[PDB]
């Protein structure tokens, strides 16, 4: 019967759980027709991690493994195959009951970052190193992290080494152009295009009419081109971390929370925090929620599903 709590954190002290970014705004989009079923930042209110969700902020959209060889590919640039391990270096077992190695990206797009290597062999017995900008196309048929390997491309033409430990540090997107297939709500095919994704965290949606999902939104950097892409998560990484630590039993399917302004002690609006780990609000518009960034959600009480939220 441990009481349920959220951390006391300003919006500026929250991290996106789907890409390593600060949270920039709360956000609604009630006319979204896509199915919302992201796999990172998934955690039940009683602390069960789901999908590909792991606890490290540095693990979100990261890969660890080994380049096996250069490969041939139509598209621009140079291409490389790498095996991927678990984030802590232990081999990934594709029969593990997860959709893919924990931290694997959960959306279609060209993910821009840096590939770096530190050789295992040995110069003062000091290993050789290199790092280069890289792009991982998660929509591609060669993106098969559930099978233990992925592809990435570089602008660099040859300075990537086979058989050496490899790390991908995510930075942003390469492009949001038409042929870059950015869609934050389309899952990758974790095993390749003709195979079913498995062990997925469930989709989320409002049920009571008049309600919509409330997202923690971050704007994601672009390597070049035009656009203002954003990534919406259901709960910031710090809530994932806190809920996991607390392991508090959920006393209903819906926790009523209030967004409070500590400068005034007042509630700005209320929201439903649902057992599976997401928020709904009674809002009839899209766009940012304009609220003091010093404010924060506070747990009020457990309510039933038929509770009527005061409109925002």
């Amino acid at each position, epitope marked *: 019967s441990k009481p349920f709590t959220l951390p006391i954190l300003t919006l500026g002290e929250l991290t996106n759980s789907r890409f390593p970014l600060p949270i920039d705004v709360l956000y609604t989009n009630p006319n979204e027709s896509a199915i919302v079923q992201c796999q990172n930042g998934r955690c039940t209110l009683d602390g069960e*991690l789901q999908g590909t969700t792991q606890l490290l902020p540095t693990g979100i959209c990261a890969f660890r493994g080994k380049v096996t060889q250069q490969v041939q590919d139509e598209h621009r640039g140079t291409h490389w195959n790498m095996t991927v391990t678990n984030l802590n270096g232990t081999p990934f077992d594709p029969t593990e009951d997860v959709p893919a190695p924990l931290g694997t990206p959960d959306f279609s797009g060209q993910i821009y970052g840096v590939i770096s290597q530190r050789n295992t062999n040995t110069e003062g017995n000091l290993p050789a190193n290199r790092a280069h900008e890289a792009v991982i196309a998660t929509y591609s048929p060669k993106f098969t992290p559930k099978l233990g390997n992925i592809q990435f491309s570089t602008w660099e033409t040859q300075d990537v080494s086979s058989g050496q430990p490899t790390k991908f540090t995510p930075v942003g997107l390469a492009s949001v152009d038409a042929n870059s297939h950015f869609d934050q709500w389309t899952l990758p095919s974790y095993s390749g295009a003709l195979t079913l994704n498995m062990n997925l965290a469930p989709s989320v949606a409002p049920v009571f009419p008049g309600e919509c999902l409330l997202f923690f939104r971050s704007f994601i950097p672009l390597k070049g081109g035009y656009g203002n892409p954003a990534i919406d998560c259901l709960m910031p990484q710090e809530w994932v971390q806190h809920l996991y630590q607390e*392991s508090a039993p959920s006393l209903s399917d819906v926790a009523l929370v209030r967004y409070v302004n500590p400068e005034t002690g007042r509630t700005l609006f209320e929201a439903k925090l649902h057992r599976n780990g997401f928020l709904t609000v009674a809002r009839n518009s899209a766009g940012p929620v304009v609220a003091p960034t010093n404010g924060y959600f506070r747990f009020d009480s457990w309510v039933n599903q038929f509770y009527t939220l005061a409109p925002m």
Partner: nanobody
Amino acid sequence: QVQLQESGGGLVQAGGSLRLSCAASGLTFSTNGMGWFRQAPGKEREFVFGVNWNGGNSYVADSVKGRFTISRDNAKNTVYLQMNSLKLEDTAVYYCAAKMGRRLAVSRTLEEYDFRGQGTQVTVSS
């Protein structure tokens, strides 16, 4: 399609050791919590040793603390109860239980688990 199968039990003298095995099918131990209970005739069941999905949190019964340990072989989807020094109090049927999900908490009551095996018998004699 979840099955849990225990083995490794036997007859042993006080001060001896066994290694129990719990193999699973339809479920990977690396993504769920599990626990060992024991059931001797004429005695209420007792929680022995439990662990969460990544092994980062456990519960060990005070009576067995310095004597029982656990290990896992993820490749074999099997976890082990190592009983390094057995006492006469330990005689019982030791069985395996799984609770679905990747969480921190380690449940100590059987009704909170989702699956159990039949067990394997352990007798400490002389």
